[PDB]
């Protein structure tokens, strides 16, 4: 439903967070914080976790 494209390269501190580098596409499946959402990489469903919206771009535009 909700899609985001990683516009930056961010790394997870814990197992909870999702490490993503610029160019990745994440399907947002949930939300934790305003600036921290939950999802998994489109072509990589094994990569799931919570990622900062600060480093990604909402693809509802």
């Amino acid at each position: 439903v909700r899609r985001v494209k990683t516009i930056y390269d961010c790394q997870a501190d814990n197992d909870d967070e999702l490490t993503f580098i610029e160019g990745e596409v994440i399907i947002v499946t949930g939300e934790e914080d305003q600036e921290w959402w939950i999802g998994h990489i489109e072509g990589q469903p094994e990569r799931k976790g919570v990622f900062p919206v600060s480093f990604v771009h909402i693809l509802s535009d």
Binding site: I7, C10, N14, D16, E22, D33, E35, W36, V50, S54
Partner: peptide
Amino acid sequence: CIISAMPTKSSRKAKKPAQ
């Protein structure tokens, strides 16, 4: 294509640093 300059990890307020 990197957008702007790198932002700051705002620290996930939802999660607490389990010590």
